[PDB]
Structure 1
Amino acid sequence: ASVYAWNRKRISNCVADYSVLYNSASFSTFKCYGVSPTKLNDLCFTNVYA
């Protein structure tokens, strides 16, 4: 989607294997604020928003 009409996808009731993202080489920018992605494998949340 265009930036002005940016899409939002809600993620809930699922297991998040963040490795697939932080082990991939397909990304040029991967910047996590207030968190480290590796630790996200040990963390739970009520919702995520992509």
Structure 2
Amino acid sequence: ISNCVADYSVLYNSASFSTFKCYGVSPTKLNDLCFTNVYADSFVIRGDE
């Protein structure tokens, strides 16, 4: 996922997700820095593992 402007509204505070926390990055004001590229992996894991 390249050449974006990433609006993290629905991921952070409009969320319905079991967790939202990022290793080594403060997930509260992640808007005011950026990186070369960011990706998206998706797999199917049951609610214990």
Using the size of structure 1 for normalisation, the TM-score is 0.64
- C-alpha separation in 2, matches of 1:39 and 1:25: 16
Q: Percent identity?
A: 100
- Higher share in helix: 1
How big is the alpha-carbon RMSD for the aligned residues of Structure 1 and Structure 2? 1.3
Q: Name the residue aligned to 1:12.
A: 2
Q: CA deviation at 1:24?
A: 2.0
SS in 2 for 1:39: coil
- Contact 1:12/1:47 (8 A) holds in 2: yes
Using the size of structure 2 for normalisation, the TM-score is 0.65
Count of residues paired in the alignment: 40
In structure 1, runs of 5+ residues without a counterpart are 1-10
4+ residue stretches of structure 1 with deviation over 3 A? none
Q: CA deviation at 1:39?
A: 2.2
In structure 2, runs of 5+ residues without a counterpart are 41-49
- Contact 1:18/1:41 (8 A) holds in 2: yes
- Higher share in strand: 1
